[PDB]
């Protein structure tokens, strides 16, 4: 196994971040980075990556969270982030 976790303080614009998070919901888990948007605080500071995975908001680690629990602590942040991810480069499955 092996993964890179690193973080990101980010302050929104019009756009907000500029990113699209995702993760399955319904009856391993997680929230992960699905795109960004063009021009935005999130592609303009480089770092993050389509597939990251988002495990922590602004001192908040989701790790345990449901999915959409995690969505929620996303859309109610203000307009300064700071998010950690993780990055998984190997895997055993």
Same mark, same amino acid.
Request: proline share 3%; net charge negative; hydrophobic share 35%.
């Given at each position: 196994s092996m993964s890179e976790t690193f973080? =990101?303080?980010?302050?929104?614009? =019009?756009?907000?971040?500029?990113?699209? &998070? !995702?993760?399955? &919901?319904?009856?391993?888990?997680?929230?992960? =980075?699905?795109? &960004?948007?063009?021009?935005? !605080? =999130?592609?303009?500071?480089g770092r993050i990556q389509i597939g990251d995975q988002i495990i922590a908001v602004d001192g908040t680690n989701l790790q345990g969270f449901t999915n959409q629990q995690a969505v929620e602590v996303l859309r109610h942040t203000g307009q300064t982030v700071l998010l950690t991810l993780m990055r998984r480069g190997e895997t055993s499955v």
């Open positions: 973080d =990101v303080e980010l302050t929104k614009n =019009v756009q907000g971040l500029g990113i699209t &998070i !995702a993760g399955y &919901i319904g009856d391993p888990s997680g929230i992960f =980075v699905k795109s &960004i948007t063009k021009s935005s !605080a =999130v592609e303009h500071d």
